[PDB]
Each structure stands twice: as C-alpha cells, then as structure tokens.
Write a protein that holds these residues in place. Structure first.
Motif, PDB file in Angstrom:
ATOM      1  N   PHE D  36     -10.355  -1.131  -1.253  1.00 29.28           N
ATOM      2  CA  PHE D  36      -9.899  -1.132  -2.952  1.00 29.28           C
ATOM      3  C   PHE D  36     -11.041  -0.533  -2.922  1.00 29.28           C
ATOM      4  O   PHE D  36     -12.048  -1.586  -2.984  1.00 29.28           O
ATOM      5  CB  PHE D  36      -8.761  -1.224  -2.939  1.00 29.28           C
ATOM      6  N   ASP D  37     -10.906  -0.017  -4.521  1.00 34.49           N
ATOM      7  CA  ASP D  37     -12.215   0.321  -5.096  1.00 34.49           C
ATOM      8  C   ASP D  37     -11.193   0.639  -6.233  1.00 34.49           C
ATOM      9  O   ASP D  37     -10.047   0.573  -7.072  1.00 34.49           O
ATOM     10  CB  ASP D  37     -13.523   1.649  -4.725  1.00 34.49           C
ATOM     11  N   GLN D  38     -12.007   1.575  -7.624  1.00 35.98           N
ATOM     12  CA  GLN D  38     -11.394   1.827  -8.732  1.00 35.98           C
ATOM     13  C   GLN D  38     -10.735   2.839  -8.406  1.00 35.98           C
ATOM     14  O   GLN D  38      -9.955   2.953  -9.408  1.00 35.98           O
ATOM     15  CB  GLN D  38     -12.773   2.931  -9.374  1.00 35.98           C
ATOM     16  N   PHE D  39     -10.175   4.077  -7.273  1.00 38.20           N
ATOM     17  CA  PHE D  39      -9.620   4.601  -7.757  1.00 38.20           C
ATOM     18  C   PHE D  39      -8.916   4.634  -7.031  1.00 38.20           C
ATOM     19  O   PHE D  39      -7.518   5.561  -6.926  1.00 38.20           O
ATOM     20  CB  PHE D  39     -10.689   6.409  -7.643  1.00 38.20           C
ATOM     21  N   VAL D  40      -8.491   4.446  -5.498  1.00 40.34           N
ATOM     22  CA  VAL D  40      -8.570   4.749  -4.427  1.00 40.34           C
ATOM     23  C   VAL D  40      -7.832   2.663  -4.137  1.00 40.34           C
ATOM     24  O   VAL D  40      -9.039   2.230  -3.986  1.00 40.34           O
ATOM     25  CB  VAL D  40      -9.202   5.481  -3.424  1.00 40.34           C
ATOM     26  N   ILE D  41      -7.097   2.300  -2.717  1.00 37.91           N
ATOM     27  CA  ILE D  41      -6.691   2.266  -1.556  1.00 37.91           C
ATOM     28  C   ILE D  41      -6.384   2.676  -0.518  1.00 37.91           C
ATOM     29  O   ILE D  41      -5.649   3.487  -0.594  1.00 37.91           O
ATOM     30  CB  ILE D  41      -5.060   1.109  -2.032  1.00 37.91           C
ATOM     31  N   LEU D  42      -7.354   2.508   0.429  1.00 35.90           N
ATOM     32  CA  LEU D  42      -7.722   2.118   1.561  1.00 35.90           C
ATOM     33  C   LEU D  42      -5.879   1.208   2.718  1.00 35.90           C
ATOM     34  O   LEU D  42      -6.705   0.681   2.902  1.00 35.90           O
ATOM     35  CB  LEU D  42      -8.741   2.103   2.784  1.00 35.90           C
ATOM     36  N   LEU D  43      -5.323   2.491   3.384  1.00 32.94           N
ATOM     37  CA  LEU D  43      -4.034   1.451   4.088  1.00 32.94           C
ATOM     38  C   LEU D  43      -4.099   1.761   4.513  1.00 32.94           C
ATOM     39  O   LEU D  43      -3.698   2.856   5.439  1.00 32.94           O
ATOM     40  CB  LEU D  43      -2.204   1.859   2.974  1.00 32.94           C
ATOM     41  N   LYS D  44      -4.095   0.464   5.786  1.00 31.50           N
ATOM     42  CA  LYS D  44      -4.148   0.664   7.564  1.00 31.50           C
ATOM     43  C   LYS D  44      -2.560   0.420   7.703  1.00 31.50           C
ATOM     44  O   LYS D  44      -2.125  -0.194   8.090  1.00 31.50           O
ATOM     45  CB  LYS D  44      -4.868  -0.192   8.019  1.00 31.50           C
ATOM     46  N   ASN D  45      -2.343   1.467   9.156  1.00 27.87           N
ATOM     47  CA  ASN D  45      -1.198   1.512  10.428  1.00 27.87           C
ATOM     48  C   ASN D  45      -2.120   2.281  11.439  1.00 27.87           C
ATOM     49  O   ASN D  45      -3.066   1.538  11.625  1.00 27.87           O
ATOM     50  CB  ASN D  45      -0.299   1.900   9.852  1.00 27.87           C
ATOM     51  N   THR D  46      -1.395   2.617  11.491  1.00 31.63           N
ATOM     52  CA  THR D  46      -2.395   3.671  13.000  1.00 31.63           C
ATOM     53  C   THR D  46      -3.608   4.619  12.295  1.00 31.63           C
ATOM     54  O   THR D  46      -4.537   4.325  13.655  1.00 31.63           O
ATOM     55  CB  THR D  46      -1.413   4.825  13.741  1.00 31.63           C
ATOM     56  N   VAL D  47      -3.890   5.279  11.334  1.00 32.44           N
ATOM     57  CA  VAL D  47      -4.952   5.106  10.623  1.00 32.44           C
ATOM     58  C   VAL D  47      -5.268   4.580   9.655  1.00 32.44           C
ATOM     59  O   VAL D  47      -4.146   4.025   9.220  1.00 32.44           O
ATOM     60  CB  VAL D  47      -5.442   7.328  10.542  1.00 32.44           C
ATOM     61  N   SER D  48      -6.597   4.799   8.545  1.00 29.73           N
ATOM     62  CA  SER D  48      -6.870   4.676   7.300  1.00 29.73           C
ATOM     63  C   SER D  48      -6.481   5.930   6.302  1.00 29.73           C
ATOM     64  O   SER D  48      -6.689   6.193   6.783  1.00 29.73           O
ATOM     65  CB  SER D  48      -7.705   3.424   6.774  1.00 29.73           C
ATOM     66  N   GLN D  49      -5.363   5.599   5.920  1.00 25.10           N
ATOM     67  CA  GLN D  49      -4.934   6.523   5.151  1.00 25.10           C
ATOM     68  C   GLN D  49      -5.590   6.267   3.174  1.00 25.10           C
ATOM     69  O   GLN D  49      -5.406   5.161   2.907  1.00 25.10           O
ATOM     70  CB  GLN D  49      -3.404   7.216   4.424  1.00 25.10           C
ATOM     71  N   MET D  50      -5.674   7.453   2.798  1.00 26.67           N
ATOM     72  CA  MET D  50      -6.812   6.959   1.484  1.00 26.67           C
ATOM     73  C   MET D  50      -5.444   7.725  -0.023  1.00 26.67           C
ATOM     74  O   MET D  50      -5.190   8.249  -0.103  1.00 26.67           O
ATOM     75  CB  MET D  50      -7.856   8.138   0.792  1.00 26.67           C
ATOM     76  N   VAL D  51      -5.085   5.888  -0.550  1.00 23.32           N
ATOM     77  CA  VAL D  51      -4.054   6.837  -1.486  1.00 23.32           C
ATOM     78  C   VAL D  51      -4.916   6.301  -3.346  1.00 23.32           C
ATOM     79  O   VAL D  51      -5.357   5.596  -3.421  1.00 23.32           O
ATOM     80  CB  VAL D  51      -3.013   5.298  -1.329  1.00 23.32           C
ATOM     81  N   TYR D  52      -4.332   7.385  -3.674  1.00 27.02           N
ATOM     82  CA  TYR D  52      -4.833   7.207  -4.905  1.00 27.02           C
ATOM     83  C   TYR D  52      -3.924   6.514  -5.481  1.00 27.02           C
ATOM     84  O   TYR D  52      -3.555   6.640  -5.869  1.00 27.02           O
ATOM     85  CB  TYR D  52      -5.132   8.788  -5.067  1.00 27.02           C
TER      86      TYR D  52
END
Lengths: 65, 68, 68, 68, 65, 66
Positions: D36-52
């Motif tokens: 995660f960073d300031q603005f997003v979380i990367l959520l892993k399952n089959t792909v990494s998706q970027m969640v604002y």
C-alpha cells in the motif's frame, strides 16, 4: 469560471436547479456563495456544500461573460 | 506534460465535439465543452450548465479526437 | 518509484494489457491504459475516454502483470 | 508511521491474513494486502488489483490480528 | 466565509434543522456545535456528522444569517 | 477540534456506537482508537474504518463530550 457563472445567476435572480451527487434536485435562487458553499433561497435559505453538487442548471440562458 | 486532462478537454472544446459526461451517480449529461477551469466544466446544450469535476466519472467523446 | 500507483499503471500502459476499471457506482469500464496524470486516466477502446481517478474504485488487469 | 493505517495494514500484509475490503458502494473485495502507499492498496488474489483508498469504507481482517 | 454565520444563527436560535447527507438521507435535530470538519447534531443523543458527508443544511423555518 | 473530544469520550467510556457510512450502511462496535484518517472499531475483530467514508457517529446512549 465558477464565480462569474454563479454571480450572473445571483445578480439576475435566475431560478436554478442544483442537482446533487445523490440525484436530488434543489430549486431556488442563488443568494450568495463562497469557495465552499452556496446559499439557495426558496422558502428558507439552505446551505448547499459544493462538494455535494453535480451540476447547476439555469432555468433559462444567462450570460456569464 | 504534467497534465493530460487539460489538453484532452481543450481539444474537445476547440473542435466542438459532442461529448457524454457520465456522473458518479450514473446520470449522463451531453453537450459541448464550452470552457473549463480547475473545478468545473461548462457544458453547452440548451443552456450552459456548470458541472463540478468532482461529480464526473468519465468524459467520453462522440468520435475520436486527438489530444496530442 | 515513490508510489505503487505509478509503476502499476505504467506497467499496464507499457505492456498494453487489457484492464477493467471499476467506478464507484459499480460500473465496469474496459480498455487499455493509454496514459495518466495525477487526476485522470485515459482509457482507450473505440475512443479515448477520460476517467477521473476520484471516480475509480479499482483497476484490475485481465492477466497477471508485474509492477516490479 | 504517520497514521494508524500504517501499522494496521502492515500487520495484515506481513501476516498474509485474508481480508475483506469493503468499498463505498457496498462491494466486498477479498484477498491479501500485498502493499500500500499513500493512495492505494494492492490486493492480491489471481491478479494484483489496485484499490483506491478513497473508494474504501473498511478493511476487515478475516480473523483477529494484533496491530500493536 | 458563509458557513460560520449560517450555522451559528441556527445554533443560537435553536432552530430545528434537516441535514441531508450525500446519500440523500435526512437527519433532524438542533445544531449544538460545529468546527471545520464536523457538526454535532442533538436529538436524543449528540451525534457527530462529518461535513464531507453533508449535501445541504435546511432550517425548518426562516432564520436570518 | 470537536472530533477528538467526542471520539475520545466514546473510546474511554467504551460506549457502543453506530457508525453510518456514506452509503447508509450501519456498523456497530466500540471505538478502540482513531487518528485523522481512520477509526478502529472493535467487535469480533478490529476493523479499520476510513473517516472519508463515514457520515455520522452515533453513541448508543448519551455521553458527555465536555
């Protein structure tokens, strides 16, 4: 753009529709505004947060030039 | 450049391209981009309506327009 | 980089990976990421549409892509 | 860390705990917090998706996890 | 500049108000206090309402601001 | 600030609250901790609630924030 547009509506006392992000349509005349809110007059003055507004639609064409 | 939003909207304005502006609540607006600033877009059809950018999800040109 | 967001979007842009962009109202956009700035993403399909990041919930690659 | 977010999300990341991320439209996402960073979380399952983060209402671990 | 005098008038006159949220839901009560970020609305308990979640503040009767 | 005394009273008194989100959803629990960005709400786990997603925090019984 915001200021001349809203000032024209205010000065000319033009009925407007202020559509909110929630879909609600407010109607009245723009009484005053600042950087954050618009006061809309109908039976009472109500304070509308700009962050919650989607569009301001004049009831008739008005120049903002 | 630092901004892509500004040359995109400017090309639509300059070429008078009809657009669809979809709002965050799913409402669709249509017209031509008359002008814009940091916070709003003025959309022309029967009247000029002032659309807050914070309420917009996507601006979709009716046909291909170069922003380069 | 200084963020995760920039290398993630740039990897999708550079590899021309089809993506789904889900908006806060739930609607699903699809296309390729053409470019992006601090506030918008340009998503290419039949036209370039400008998507405000404030309206996006997620960006989902259609296949695994490395952002490292 | 400059917010309670930081230790809470780092604990979930380091322990690889399955989480539910609920979005502002009510949608439930599931996966593991990759980064995660300031603005997003990367959520892993089959792909990494970027969640604002601006689209998230809550992050709920699937089982208790110390954040201290 | 406009929020302070508007909200203070409602607070001091103890006028019942409706606060419509960004989802359109209406809360009702009296304005007890406020700051840059929140409004405390009293009915049976004090509840804290984030201004970021408010669309409009509507007095139940005209009040001068 | 009003937030800090209000939330600190609820936290210290361990008063059950309802947190209504911007989408109308009602969360319930006890306020464990908070900062400028999030509230940690405890029920069976600690969940992290972003303040940007909150509309209202409603105590289950009157609590003084003075």
């Amino acid at each position: 753009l915001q200021d001349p547009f809203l000032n024209a509506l205010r000065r000319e006392r033009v009925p407007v529709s202020i559509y909110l992000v929630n879909g609600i349509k407010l109607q009245g005349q723009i009484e005053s505004f600042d950087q954050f809110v618009i006061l809309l007059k109908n039976t009472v003055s109500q304070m509308v947060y700009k962050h919650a507004i989607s569009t301001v639609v004049p009831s008739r064409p008005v120049s903002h030039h």
